[PDB]
Amino acid sequence: ARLDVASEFRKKWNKWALSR
Predict the structure, then answer these.
(1) What's the CA gap between 4 and 20, in Å, rounded?
(2) d(CA 20, CA 8)
(3) How far apart are CA 12 and CA 9, in angstroms?
(4) How far apart are CA 7 and CA 3, in angstroms?
(5) What residues have CB less than 8 Å from 6, skipping those under 6 apart?
(6) What is the DSSP string of the chain?
(7) Long-range contacts of 11-18, Cβ-Cβ distance < 8 Å, separation of 24 or more
(8) CA–CA gap between residue 8 and residue 15 (Å, rounded)
(9) Cα–chain center distance at 6
(10) Distance between CA 7 and CA 20 in Å, rounded?
């Protein structure tokens, strides 16, 4: 399964959008 990771990666990227 690549959902737990694919989802976790979205959380780490979200900070980039909120920081940018």
Answers:
(1) 25
(2) 19
(3) 5
(4) 6
(5) none
(6) --HHHHHHHHHHHHHHHHH-
(7) none
(8) 12
(9) 7
(10) 20
